[PDB]
Design a protein around this ligand. Structure first.
Ligand code: CL
Length: 162
């Protein structure tokens, strides 16, 4: 198991513009296109992203390219983040994976906001951090997913992903 497979599981794959859990226009593997309520605006963004006149549909390959780019941006975001970098450096490999997931899902800023959880993560207090991170909108909106990420964070293994 690795970050790519893990996220592929959490996000799915769709070749057509669709709406995410929050109603945002998205495509491929969890690639947010826009928070605007306009399908057109989303088609616009999509074309710009792909470099061609898509008409709201992409290929598997195109989806994978977006995904590679997104995973890459997530890691770099982490490493460039003053709050995040130090947590990340202190973690083992499975756990780092869990941090990248959260960041891919909610944005660097978003995650950088979990001040208290981050401290616990850094202090290696697994159970506390798991509990704390659950008291969040993130968990309440997408509980099953959140649960897989939290278990990964807590245990340091891939069990949740069986
Ligand atoms: Cl869910």
């Amino acid at each position: 198991m690795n970050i790519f497979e893990m996220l592929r599981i959490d996000e799915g794959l769709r070749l057509k513009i669709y709406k995410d859990t929050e109603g945002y226009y998205t495509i491929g593997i969890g690639h947010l296109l826009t928070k605007s309520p306009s399908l057109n605006a989303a088609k616009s963004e999509l074309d710009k992203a792909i470099g061609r006149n898509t008409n709201g549909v992409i290929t598997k390959d195109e989806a994978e390219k977006l995904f590679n780019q997104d995973v890459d941006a997530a890691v770099r975001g982490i490493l460039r983040n003053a709050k995040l970098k130090p947590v990340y450096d202190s973690l083992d490999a499975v756990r780092r994976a869990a941090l990248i997931n959260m960041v891919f899902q909610m944005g660097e800023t978003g995650v950088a906001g979990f001040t208290n959880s981050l401290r616990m993560m850094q202090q290696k207090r697994w159970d506390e951090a798991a509990v704390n991170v659950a008291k969040s909108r993130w968990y309440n909106q997408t509980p099953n997913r959140a649960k897989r990420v939290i278990t990964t964070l807590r245990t340091g293994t891939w069990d949740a992903y069986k």
